[PDB]
Design a protein around this ligand. Structure first.
Ligand SMILES: Nc1ncnc2c1ncn2[C@@H]1O[C@H](CSCC[C@H](N)C(=O)O)[C@@H](O)[C@H]1O
Ligand SMILES: [Zn+2]
Ligand SMILES: [Zn+2]
Ligand SMILES: [Zn+2]
Ligand SMILES: [Zn+2]
Length: 914
DNA sequence: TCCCGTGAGCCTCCGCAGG
DNA sequence: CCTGCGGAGGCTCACGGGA
């Protein structure tokens, strides 16, 4: 695969001279041009594959309504039927109605189980189609039936790409006078073959069930008739029934009655069961803290920045600071349920009025110590208080576990790592004496005195260095036996981290065409994967080939049929894994007006897979980086389609638009934690504060950790086993000019190129970087506060660009103010990360002047080291990379953050323990 | 009436041949 | 060294609807 040049670096930007043997031989310079080489001074050191594409926040507010019910639009054209007679004897007689099985309508016979068409109010709409689930005459002498609605492909995400003859069962059903029926249409159920896995290479039919709100296609439910519903069995009804019984609060144990308030010991809601002494997740507003908090003082008056020293500082119009947790919500409040008591209504217990007497729990950042006092603490560690509060059981977000430190029968770390939602506390807090005594005898569970599953054979395609696999492995559901990675450094790094797996360094296409042609091994004698071998197929196909937003055309769609994603599906089609995971950039879901997404789903469903899609933000799963990825899940017919993970960390609301619009329809994932979460957001401080200080160019690929972990995050990434060596703490050697610039960016949050001094600097190069000169008037931007010009080209005056107007070796890059107006003032370029913020999407090659160019260390005068990047993703420091400093950066930036891959991994685990 | 996004087609120069 | 060539990725400009 052929590499190329970056557009950003100081090398590239330098224009052509005409002094070279090549510059002299160029066609434009009159040369024959047989040379075909660039300027000698324009050989970009950063030369590497820019076979990548950043993703913009293209989605709007999505301030729009959830999808209304499909067939639930009422308005159904009633027909006129002359004669409607029952047939045979009644199946069953109830108190209020009488059920039959057969009915004849205008000489036409129908039966329960038959499928009928119906006519919609609107003429445009395609006929409704449904299954008759019961027949009966009512008290009012009316002859009725119950319809279980189908749903046409075109009504789903699939849209027009659906097979016209395909319908999908849906959770919608209503009652109707038989006379609404138009015709009876035949509908076949295309169930999966006995040998489904092995088949790689004019009637209405259905195979799957469609959840509109979540865009999930799943295998028809297995629920079975009871004694009471045999004569009238409808899946849509039961589904809804079981939903409600789960959704609504009930109660399981009552202790006593008192003062018109029954006291309870055990209540349930939404599938979770709460008992006295259990702990609970609540919203931030559920209760305040009885701790005197002094409202901070209004910031001092800042002396107007010198416009002549900081010309381009005006361009910093008040703007949302990129990588700022000033928007971060607070995490769930936590408390221990002390008492439960419900009200009463109609002489009965009123389950809609359950309240909780709770012991407030302090998060370390909740004490007076504030954040500055919780930097080094376990994110799951709590401080007990005796401060109480009463809460409505309707506000409870979930159960969690909070255990006394010492009380635990294992290691604290063992405990935390043991399962989800596990907190612990060691001391207790006194909001009054602001002291830290230890837990009262009633917080503990009275005890003895003293003080302390088969794995899926996975085939990972476009594996890269194996971020994804790493996360899966962590979840313990996979054993990667084969990996395909066309790029040789990535492939090696993968081998380095997985001695058990066979990495094929080839184009997935030929590798596939090999095993299809009945080949057993590639030219290197590596055993090829055979049907039955692969249980899970995960991959990250690049879509750079056709990453377009406009509509498909003739030969643009051809570029697709030959894409890598289509190869991925040919793998899925051939191997027929139990599971299938495609991960991509967030934009995967809207490329080509979402034909990419629609077409892949269409493919999966064609094969007969259960499948869904969603967008996830990595920050929410334990990483100090903005990273939204699209995700497709698929599951063999016999399986359970997994769900999406539930956010673990609170994260900036702007970085979290997870909803997606396809054909003006709004889809979301099962994700419930919209804003808050169990844990605090991970910061740049949390990420890389323990790292030694390094200079620009630091190439030492082995240095010691001069210090211990200073973060929960770090203790997780460095493990507990003694390891004194710090690998890959190395950053790119930036031009002396660029190094000077980085030195002159302030340290405060919000710093970037716009904060640069317009001064003259003697570099450690001998060359001198000059002042930039403003010799044109900028009609849009006006004047300095002192009437100084702000334009650097004839184009700032509306006139045509003068090429001689360009300026070189200047501290403020001439090109920036030159285009800043039409590009948002390049917010972020030469920008520094901030200790309390987060990485903008980790990049494959750190350029202060690339598009995603906020990449300077918070304090040190340099770009971020390879480790700092590996750290902004989820890589354990143990994880090994391979190649020159550039190769490594690219591998890190390309990879799925293990924390995210793990989160998904665990969701899949739940489908094997089914 | 324009504006935004092209994407077919010309422009560039990377990786490697072979003298 | 050098000479030079394929071929693929980039950048351009005329052209199409989306409203
Ligand atoms: N034609 C091809 N065949 C095999 N691999 C390819 C390929 N084209 C690109 N790739 C590789 O596919 C990878 C996609 S980035 C995905 C990385 C991976 N999911 C992780 O978590 O680490 C890149 O590393 C790229 O080198
Ligand atoms: Zn460059
Ligand atoms: Zn030159
Ligand atoms: Zn029903
Ligand atoms: Zn200009």
């Amino acid at each position: 695969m052929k590499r190329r040049r970056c557009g950003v670096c100081e090398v590239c930007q330098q224009p052509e001279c005409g002094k070279c043997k090549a510059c002299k031989d160029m066609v434009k310079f009159g040369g024959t041009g047989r040379s075909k080489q660039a300027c000698l001074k324009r050989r970009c050191p950063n030369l590497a594959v820019k076979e990548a594409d950043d993703d913009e926040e293209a989605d709007d507010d999505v301030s729009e309504m959830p999808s209304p019910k499909k067939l639930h639009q009422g308005k159904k054209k009633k027909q006129n039927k002359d004669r409607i007679s029952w047939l045979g004897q009644p199946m069953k007689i109830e108190e209020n109605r009488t059920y039959y099985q057969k009915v004849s309508i205008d000489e036409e016979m129908l039966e329960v189980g038959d499928c009928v068409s119906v006519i919609p109010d609107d003429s445009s709409k395609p006929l409704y189609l449904a299954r008759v689930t019961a027949l009966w005459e009512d008290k009012n002498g009316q002859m009725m039936f119950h319809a279980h609605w189908f749903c046409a492909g075109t009504d789903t995400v699939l849209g027009a790409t659906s097979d016209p003859l395909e319908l999908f069962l849906v959770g919608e059903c209503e009652n109707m006078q038989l006379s609404y029926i138009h015709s009876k249409v035949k509908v076949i159920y295309k169930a999966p073959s006995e040998n489904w896995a092995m088949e790689g290479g004019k009637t209405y039919f259905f195979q799957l069930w469609y959840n509109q709100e979540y865009a999930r296609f799943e295998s028809p439910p297995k629920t079975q008739p009871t004694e009471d519903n045999k004569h009238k069995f409808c899946l849509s009804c039961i589904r809804l029934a079981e939903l409600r019984q789960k959704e609504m609060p009930k109660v399981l144990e009552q202790i006593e009655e008192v003062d018109g308030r029954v006291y309870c010991s055990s209540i349930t809601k939404n599938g979770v069961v709460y008992r006295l002494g259990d702990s609970v997740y609540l919203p931030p507003e559920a209760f305040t803290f009885n701790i005197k908090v002094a409202s901070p003082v209004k910031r001092p008056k800042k002396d107007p920045v010198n416009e002549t020293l900081y010309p381009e500082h005006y361009r910093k119009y008040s703007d949302y600071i990129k990588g700022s947790n000033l928007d971060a919500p607070e995490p769930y409040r936590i408390g221990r349920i002390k008492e439960i008591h419900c009200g009463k209504k109609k002489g009965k217990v009123n389950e809609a009025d359950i309240k909780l007497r709770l012991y407030k729990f302090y998060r370390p950042e909740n004490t007076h110590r504030s954040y500055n006092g919780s930097y080094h603490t376990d994110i799951n560690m709590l401080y007990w208080s005796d401060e109480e509060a009463v809460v409505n059981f309707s506000d409870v977000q979930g159960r969690c576990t909070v255990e006394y430190g010492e009380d635990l029968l294992e290691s604290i770390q063992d405990y935390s790592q043991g399962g989800p939602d596990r907190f612990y506390f060691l001391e207790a807090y006194n909001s009054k004496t602001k002291n830290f005594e230890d837990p009262p005898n009633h917080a503990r569970s009275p005890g003895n005195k003293g003080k302390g599953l088969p794995k899926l054979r996975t085939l990972d395609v476009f594996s890269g260095c194996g971020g994804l696999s790493e996360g899966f492995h962590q979840a313990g559901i996979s054993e990667t036996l084969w990996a395909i990675e066309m790029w040789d450094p990535a492939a090696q790094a993968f081998r380095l981290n997985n001695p058990g797996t066979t990495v094929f360094t080839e184009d997935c296409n030929v590798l596939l065409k090999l095993v299809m042609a009945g080949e057993v091994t590639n030219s290197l004698g590596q055993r090829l994967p055979q049907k039955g071998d692969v249980e899970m197929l995960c991959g990250g196909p690049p879509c750079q080939g056709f990453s377009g937003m406009n509509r498909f055309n003739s030969r643009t769609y051809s570029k697709f049929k030959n894409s890598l994603v289509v190869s991925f599906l040919s793998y899925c089609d051939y191997y027929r894994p139990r599971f299938f995971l495609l991960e991509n950039v967030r934009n995967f879901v809207s490329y080509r007006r979402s034909m990419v997404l629609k077409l892949t789903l269409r493919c999966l469903v064609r094969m007969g897979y259960q499948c869904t899609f969603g967008v996830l933000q990595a920050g929410q799963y334990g990483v100090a980086q903005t990273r939204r990825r699209a995700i497709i899940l698929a599951a063999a017919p016999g399986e359970k389609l997994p769900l999406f993970p539930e956010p673990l960390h609170v994260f900036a609301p702007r970085a979290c638009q997870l909803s997606v619009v396809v054909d003006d329809k709004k889809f979301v994932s099962n994700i419930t934690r919209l804003s808050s979460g169990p844990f605090r957001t991970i910061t740049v401080r949390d990420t890389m504060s323990d790292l030694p200080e390094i200079q620009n160019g630091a190439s030492n690929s082995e240095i010691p950790y001069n210090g211990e972990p200073l973060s929960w995050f770090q203790r997780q990434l460095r493990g507990s086993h003694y390891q004194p060596i710090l690998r890959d703490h190395i950053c790119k050697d930036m031009s002396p000019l660029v190094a000077a610039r980085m030195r002159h960016i302030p340290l405060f949050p919000g710093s970037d190129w716009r904060d640069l001094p317009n001064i003259q600097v003697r570099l450690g190069d001998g060359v001198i970087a000059h002042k930039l000169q403003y010799t044109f008037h900028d009609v849009k931007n006006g004047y300095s506060s002192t009437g100084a010009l702000r334009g650097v080209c004839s184009c700032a005056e509306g006139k045509a660009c003068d090429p001689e107007s360009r300026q070189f070796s200047t501290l403020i890059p001439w090109c920036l103010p030159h285009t800043g107006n039409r590009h948002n003032h390049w917010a972020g370029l030469y920008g520094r990360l901030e200790w309390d913020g987060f990485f903008s999407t980790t990049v494959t090659n750190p350029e202060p002047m690339g598009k995603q160019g906020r990449v300077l260390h918070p304090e040190q005068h340099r770009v971020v080291s390879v480790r700092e990047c590996a750290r902004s993703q989820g890589f354990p420091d143990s994880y090994r990379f391979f190649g020159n400093i550039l190769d490594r950066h690219r591998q890190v930036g390309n990879a799925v953050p293990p924390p995210l891959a793990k989160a998904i991994g665990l969701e899949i685990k739940l489908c094997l323990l089914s």
